[PDB]
């Protein structure tokens, strides 16, 4: 048997449709970008909860994630990342 | 004229066919 | 949205008593401070009675459900869709038996009036046979798509409830035999989420109503 495997490939392809509607993706490229988000997710979350443990505070929260991303990303990308995280969570909380 | 294929004509063919069957049977009788 | 928020925040916990319902429904038709798209939302998300609607309140509401004519040009008119929505709320919650038959004549309300008249036809004495002539007339009128099934629902109530009458049953057979709209009319919806809010409005303070 073979269990259903987690993937973000549909979302990756959709955002590529938004960017370049005429462009497709190779299978190897799609596996590569599917691995991108999981690798980033891990190296953000571990650092964020380690920072939370340094705070000796129970909850991993938005401030912890913001700090973790701005720690680990190179600064030029970090500015964009924190701005987009903040505006996204604000748009959500405005619901 | 009037176009139709329903009751009042479809039964006529059946009646006529059974009548012809009766006639051919009767033709063989002694009387 | 500030004014509507006050109505929301009050009705959600304070409810809306009969005079409060009378005052607000008057405000909806008499004032422009409430937008029409919100009027079709206030009547079914903020109108939360403490119990059954009192007779005078229903009579005062009925004045909103009228229509202008070449007689009644001077009367301010509630939009028919808002009138229909108001009837839909009335479905959620003894001359009034006679009043509500003539509400049912209106094409855009008649489907929502069927439970109201049926909930007046609750005794063998309330029903009268001549009333079915008016009901039959609309059922047979072109342009009343809901009237055939709507009338058949009322007719099916009269035939069993009356217990003693002339052969009005065959007049039911005349109404549309496909009965396509009658299936939904006999399976009306109470809008559970509105009801669930109304359950708390009936539980916060008072029993027996």
């Amino acid at each position: 048997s073979k269990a259903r495997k987690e993937t973000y490939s549909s979302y990756i392809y959709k955002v590529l449709k938004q960017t370049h509607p005429d462009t497709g993706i190779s299978q190897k490229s799609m596996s590569i970008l599917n691995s991108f988000v999981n690798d980033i997710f891990e190296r953000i979350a571990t650092e964020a909860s380690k920072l939370a443990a340094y705070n000796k505070k129970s909850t991993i929260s938005a401030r912890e994630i913001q700090t973790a991303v701005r720690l680990i990303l190179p600064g030029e990308l970090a500015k964009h990342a924190v701005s987009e995280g903040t505006r996204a969570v604000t748009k959500y909380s405005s619901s | 004229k009037q176009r139709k294929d329903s009751h009042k004509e479809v039964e006529r063919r059946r009646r006529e066919n059974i009548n012809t069957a009766i006639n051919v049977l009767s033709d063989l009788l002694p009387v | 949205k500030t004014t509507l928020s006050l109505l929301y925040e009050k009705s959600k916990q304070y409810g809306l008593s009969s005079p409060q319902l009378q005052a607000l429904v008057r405000l909806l038709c008499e004032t422009s401070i409430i937008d029409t798209v919100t009027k079709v939302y206030i009547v079914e998300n903020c109108f939360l009675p403490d119990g059954y609607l009192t007779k005078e309140l229903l009579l005062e509401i009925i004045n909103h459900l009228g229509t202008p004519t070449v007689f009644s040009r001077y009367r301010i008119q509630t939009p028919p869709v808002l009138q229909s929505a108001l009837c839909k709320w009335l479905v959620h919650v003894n001359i009034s038996s006679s009043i509500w038959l003539h509400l049912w004549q209106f094409s855009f309300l008649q489907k929502w009036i069927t439970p109201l008249v049926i909930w007046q036809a609750t005794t063998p004495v309330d029903v009268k046979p001549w009333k079915l002539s008016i009901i039959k007339r609309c059922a047979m009128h072109p342009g009343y798509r809901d009237a055939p099934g709507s009338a058949t629902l009322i007719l099916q109530r009269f035939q069993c409830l009356v217990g003693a009458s002339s052969q009005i049953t065959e007049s039911i057979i005349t109404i549309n035999c496909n009965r396509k709209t009658l299936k939904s009319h006999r399976n009306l919806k109470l809008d559970a989420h509105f009801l669930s809010i109304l359950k708390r409005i009936l539980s916060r303070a008072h029993p027996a109503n």
Partner: protein, 92 residues
Amino acid sequence: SIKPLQIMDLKHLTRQFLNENRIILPKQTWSTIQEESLNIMDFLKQKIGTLQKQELVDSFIDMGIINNVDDMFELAHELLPLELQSRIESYL
């Protein structure tokens, strides 16, 4: 050709009319009324090329449907939903 009106629409319309006078219709009858509705519509466009209250009452009188404007809004009452015939009465 895009002119034709559906047989089912004619069925739904004429179902109510059957109650005022019970016409009973075989299939090819339905098809012929649907087909000749195009000719009827063209003939009406000839008879009524433009719409006015005096024009429409005169056209319907010419059609033999009515005798006067009184008969005309009687027809409107018996052919329209309740609020509308009042709206037309405001127009007359």
